[PDB]
């Protein structure tokens, strides 16, 4: 028997054994997340420890089949993924040091407390204490206090840990034959051995920067309009040509500008579309919300929810005694077991969230026939892109009128369209410079282009230049402001939120095309279109079996990430923004700071 | 008026594993086949060669009842000319099979929260099964070229795998009890008519 034949047999045994152990860990994890007891934590850890130990042993066994002797690409895709980074390429000692560092940084972030001066007992966590201030408060000093105290007391703790975190992560990546840890992260988009669909790790940097250049005109006018509105609110705090202060952006970091809508709404007299009252008037419950979401996917040709989905999912808050983690999640336990965990309330937001989470389920069911190691999105940005487009169609006035939630007499004027698109841009467009700049900083730190004594100097130079955001207080190299975000301190790649944003509007434009939609892209609804559902399903069933470039081509007909559909979506706002900024300065100066 | 003991086969407390499928020879009795086909309790009732519609008007020398448990998605493998882990390694039907295949969902009996590991199936074998062949061997499968010495190891796997039926499984992974009826016709007494 050849090496490839032995790899096929080895993967055959791995799949069956992995599915059984993965189901046991997922079931134990589900029981805790819906029923929080001291016991359930132990069973979750016990099942999880067996699953992790099994993966470690199988990864070592997979290494004894060298990839150079395999020709079947599907076999090589499963084998390399199993070979992962290996079973701790580093030494045991360095693997133990890195593990403790990751746990300490996570503990500091989740337990970091900030206490108001003159009362060492009234202290606030980031959630919900500091997040509430950054999202609702209009007081300049209160927002500044929360912004600075979080970075000066929690970020300063993370600075020495993150420095050693970079060294150990690079050592693991370079011993895995990667240039650095950033190059290791970019490997999620790497494609080899497929003519016409290959993609290099370095090409991701090229494509992200090239697509971001076309985003700049849209973001610059969005930045100028937001600055003008904020300058009317804080006239003694904002220069008309300078960057936006970092603590006046809607959250702790300015990742999303969503909470700036109240101060930046174009037409504050035309209210939002809120069908929450209509849902309560018609006595809707959680099952009705998910029944309507199931109705939506069936209308496009996708299968209905399995019978175990309705019996085993938890679509409501359990009660007053039995506690559960209420973060909306879609669960793929394997063995045909698909569930949704959600403490659903009768609101418009939860109505759209159900469509988002059921979009994850439809993706999970579509590639269930694939081998175990290929049961995932085409790349890291595919899964959430699929989920996002479901809420796009479900939230349109066209869709809400067809299901009886929006009255037919209600008609939309162009002022409400500008209000809706502006709210979308604050969340979608606003995060793109933030996401790209943050990951570029980490890429350069891993690459070694930023010395240790210039981490914070470079961090705020790029914030001023790329994001147009200026720190309110000077920060020396004792600060670790990037680590004050969850993803940086908890070791998560961040470029996925940039690529996913461009993917979703590429998906929506292609599906709306197949649905023969007429008019602006933001008003489209793919409901009742089996042509759109079939086009999406051709990619969903692929899973990880094919290169993401080919999977993307199945939906949109293009092999690479493209930014044109994103600009097509926001074109009505971009035209409106340019007309608004005729009396305002467009762009920003990087030398102005609120601390002079 | 001896009635064929079909209740022993269909209503057994525990079924066999598919790799060790049971066979019950039925002889010298009266079989009312129309009761089974017109009961509306089976998800699968497909007959090959013979017709399930009122063909209890025929005599056969011997009738064999083969019973085992597989998951739902593998029921389609119990048919002539099929391929898969069950068909090639556990239970094989001939191309000219004359008989009926009967299956029904048994999630209420063969599933248990936490996993029911009583039912097994053969995952590896040197070659495919000849029709109506049974292999209950536990020899360690040699995937490579180094002898296994009768214990699991690198390229040396235990050939039998467990379903681990749990009640929360999907329909395709839920246990199904399968009964296969073989109708043999020799130049023989033909002792099983069953009006
Ligand atoms: C890679 O290997 C897989 C499986 O080892 C091949 O897929 C099999 O194709 C045969 C027909 O040639 C089918 O009978 C099997 O059911 C298939 N199995 C699976 C798991 O798909 C696949 O064709 C191989 N690819 C290449 C390019 O050789
Ligand atoms: C919650 O878990 C406990 C064991 O930790 C169990 O006894 C109880 O029945 C569970 N409750 C529910 C509603 O599942
Ligand atoms: C799903 O649709 C199928 C028809 O294709 C039907 O047989 C089944 O009962 C439906 N299940 C649910 C839960 O609606
Ligand atoms: C889809 O078609 C059905 C039947 O024609 C109709 O009841 C429903 O309103 C349509 N939905 C949309 C979103 O147009
Ligand atoms: C809405 O349309 C009217 C009619 O043409 C126009 O006068 C107005 O400026 C439009 N509002 C916009 C584009 O915000
Ligand atoms: C199994 O038991 C049920 C109920 O007692 C009966 O109707 C059925 O006929 C039995 N099966 C056979 C093969 O007789
Ligand atoms: Zn999601």
Numbering used by the authors:
A (entry chain A): 19 to 614
B (entry chain B): 333 to 527
Sentences from the paper on this structure:
The binding of RBD to the receptor hACE2 is an essential step for virus to entry cell, thus we first explored if the binding of six SARS-CoV-2 variant (including Alpha, Beta, Gamma, Mink-Y453F, Mink-F486L and Mink-N501T) RBDs to hACE2 were changed in comparison with wild-type (WT) SARS-CoV-2 (the first strain of SARS-CoV-2 which was isolated from a clinical patient on Jan 6, 2020, GISAID: EPI_ISL_402119) RBD. Each complex structure was comprised of one copy of the RBD-hACE2 molecule in one asymmetric unit.
N501Y in the receptor-binding domain (RBD) of S protein is a common substitution in Alpha, Beta, and Gamma strains, and is often found in combination with E484K and K417N (or K417T), with this combination described in the RBD of both the Beta and Gamma strains, respectively. For the detailed mutated positions, in Alpha RBD-hACE2, Beta RBD-hACE2, and Gamma RBD-hACE2 structures, N501 is located in a loop structure and could be replaced by a Y without creating folding problems, it seems that the N501Y does not induce a large conformational change. Some very weak hydrogen bonds are possible between N501 and ACE2, but the phenyl of the Y501 side chain could make many new favorable nonbonded interactions with hACE2, i.e., a cation-π interaction with hACE2 K353 and a π-π stacking interaction with hACE2 Y41. Thus, Y501 significantly increased the interaction between RBD and hACE2 compared to N501, so the N501Y replacement in this region of the interface should be favorable for the interaction with hACE2. In addition, the E484K substitutions would seem neutral or even unfavorable because it is far away from the RBD-interacting residues of hACE2. The deep mutational scanning suggests that single residue mutation K417N or K417T is likely to have minimal effect on the binding to hACE2, and that the E484K mutation may predictably enhance the binding, while in this study the structures of Beta RBD-hACE2 and Gamma RBD-hACE2 indicated the mutations, K417N and K417T, decreased the RBD-hACE2 interactions while the mutation E484K displayed little impact. Interestingly, the decreased impact caused by K417N or K417T could be quantitatively counteracted by the increased binding effect associated with the N501Y mutation.
